[PDB]
Ligand binder design. Structure first.
Ligand SMILES: *[C@@H]1O[C@H](CO)[C@@H](O)[C@H](O)[C@H]1O
Ligand SMILES: *[C@@H]1O[C@H](CO)[C@@H](O)[C@H](O)[C@H]1O
Ligand SMILES: *[C@@H]1O[C@H](CO)[C@@H](O)[C@H](O)[C@H]1O
Ligand SMILES: *[C@@H]1O[C@H](CO)[C@@H](O)[C@H](O)[C@H]1O
Ligand SMILES: *[C@H]1C[C@](C)(N)C(O)(O)[C@H](C)O1
Ligand SMILES: *[C@H]1C[C@](C)(N)C(O)(O)[C@H](C)O1
Ligand SMILES: *[C@H]1C[C@](C)(N)C(O)(O)[C@H](C)O1
Ligand SMILES: *[C@H]1C[C@](C)(N)C(O)(O)[C@H](C)O1
Lengths: 7, 7, 7, 7
Protein backbone atom coordinates (compact mmCIF):
# COMPACT_ATOMS: atom_id res chain seq x y z
CA UNK A 1 0.00 0.00 0.00
CA UNK A 2 0.74 3.59 0.54
CA UNK A 3 -2.55 5.07 -0.76
CA UNK A 4 -5.43 4.94 1.71
CA UNK A 5 -8.88 3.71 1.03
CA UNK A 6 -11.31 2.51 2.36
CA UNK A 7 -12.38 -0.08 -0.14
CA UNK B 1 -17.67 12.59 4.88
CA UNK B 2 -17.02 8.91 5.42
CA UNK B 3 -14.77 7.93 2.53
CA UNK B 4 -11.02 8.16 3.13
CA UNK B 5 -8.45 9.42 0.80
CA UNK B 6 -5.67 10.56 0.53
CA UNK B 7 -6.01 13.06 -2.22
CA UNK C 1 -11.15 17.18 -5.01
CA UNK C 2 -11.69 20.87 -5.53
CA UNK C 3 -14.32 21.76 -2.94
CA UNK C 4 -13.05 22.98 0.42
CA UNK C 5 -14.38 22.07 3.77
CA UNK C 6 -13.80 21.88 6.71
CA UNK C 7 -15.53 18.75 7.81
CA UNK D 1 -16.49 33.59 9.55
CA UNK D 2 -15.06 30.27 10.82
CA UNK D 3 -16.37 27.63 8.40
CA UNK D 4 -14.50 27.37 5.09
CA UNK D 5 -16.11 27.19 1.71
CA UNK D 6 -15.60 27.79 -1.19
CA UNK D 7 -18.88 29.22 -2.32
C1 LIG E 1 -4.21 3.72 7.99
O1 LIG E 1 -5.40 2.97 8.27
C2 LIG E 1 -5.02 1.69 8.89
C3 LIG E 1 -6.40 0.91 9.12
O2 LIG E 1 -7.19 1.55 9.99
C4 LIG E 1 -4.24 1.87 10.11
O3 LIG E 1 -3.79 0.64 10.67
C5 LIG E 1 -3.09 2.87 9.96
O4 LIG E 1 -2.62 3.17 11.26
C6 LIG E 1 -3.57 4.09 9.30
O5 LIG E 1 -2.50 4.98 9.14
C1 LIG F 1 -7.96 7.24 8.72
O1 LIG F 1 -8.97 6.34 9.01
C2 LIG F 1 -8.42 5.07 9.44
C3 LIG F 1 -9.62 4.06 9.61
O2 LIG F 1 -10.47 4.47 10.59
C4 LIG F 1 -7.68 5.27 10.73
O3 LIG F 1 -7.14 4.01 11.12
C5 LIG F 1 -6.58 6.29 10.52
O4 LIG F 1 -5.91 6.53 11.77
C6 LIG F 1 -7.14 7.57 9.95
O5 LIG F 1 -6.07 8.43 9.62
C1 LIG G 1 -7.63 26.25 1.58
O1 LIG G 1 -7.81 26.83 0.32
C2 LIG G 1 -7.76 28.28 0.43
C3 LIG G 1 -8.12 28.77 -1.01
O2 LIG G 1 -7.21 28.43 -1.97
C4 LIG G 1 -6.35 28.67 0.81
O3 LIG G 1 -6.31 30.11 0.96
C5 LIG G 1 -6.04 28.03 2.16
O4 LIG G 1 -4.70 28.34 2.55
C6 LIG G 1 -6.25 26.55 2.11
O5 LIG G 1 -6.12 26.03 3.44
C1 LIG H 1 -8.86 30.53 4.33
O1 LIG H 1 -8.98 30.88 2.92
C2 LIG H 1 -8.79 32.35 2.83
C3 LIG H 1 -9.05 32.72 1.27
O2 LIG H 1 -8.08 32.16 0.47
C4 LIG H 1 -7.47 32.73 3.27
O3 LIG H 1 -7.29 34.17 3.22
C5 LIG H 1 -7.12 32.17 4.63
O4 LIG H 1 -5.73 32.40 4.85
C6 LIG H 1 -7.44 30.74 4.71
O5 LIG H 1 -7.15 30.24 6.00
C1 LIG I 1 -13.58 2.83 5.17
C2 LIG I 1 -14.74 3.75 5.28
C3 LIG I 1 -15.94 3.36 4.40
C4 LIG I 1 -15.68 3.67 2.97
N1 LIG I 1 -17.13 4.20 4.84
C5 LIG I 1 -16.24 1.89 4.63
O1 LIG I 1 -16.65 1.69 6.01
O2 LIG I 1 -17.24 1.41 3.77
C6 LIG I 1 -14.95 1.03 4.40
C7 LIG I 1 -15.14 -0.46 4.71
O3 LIG I 1 -13.95 1.49 5.34
C1 LIG J 1 -2.19 10.05 1.63
C2 LIG J 1 -1.30 9.00 1.07
C3 LIG J 1 -0.74 9.34 -0.30
C4 LIG J 1 -1.74 9.13 -1.40
N1 LIG J 1 0.42 8.42 -0.56
C5 LIG J 1 -0.15 10.76 -0.26
O1 LIG J 1 0.96 10.73 0.62
O2 LIG J 1 0.31 11.18 -1.52
C6 LIG J 1 -1.23 11.76 0.26
C7 LIG J 1 -0.70 13.21 0.40
O3 LIG J 1 -1.63 11.35 1.53
C1 LIG K 1 -12.36 23.80 9.51
C2 LIG K 1 -13.07 24.89 10.23
C3 LIG K 1 -14.16 24.42 11.15
C4 LIG K 1 -15.40 24.01 10.43
N1 LIG K 1 -14.49 25.57 12.06
C5 LIG K 1 -13.61 23.36 12.04
O1 LIG K 1 -12.60 23.94 12.93
O2 LIG K 1 -14.56 22.80 12.94
C6 LIG K 1 -12.96 22.23 11.21
C7 LIG K 1 -12.34 21.16 12.08
O3 LIG K 1 -11.96 22.75 10.40
C1 LIG L 1 -13.24 27.43 -3.92
C2 LIG L 1 -13.07 26.22 -4.77
C3 LIG L 1 -14.23 25.97 -5.76
C4 LIG L 1 -15.41 25.40 -5.11
N1 LIG L 1 -13.74 25.00 -6.77
C5 LIG L 1 -14.53 27.27 -6.51
O1 LIG L 1 -13.34 27.56 -7.33
O2 LIG L 1 -15.64 27.13 -7.34
C6 LIG L 1 -14.78 28.43 -5.46
C7 LIG L 1 -14.91 29.79 -6.20
O3 LIG L 1 -13.59 28.58 -4.68
Amino acid sequence: XXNXXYX
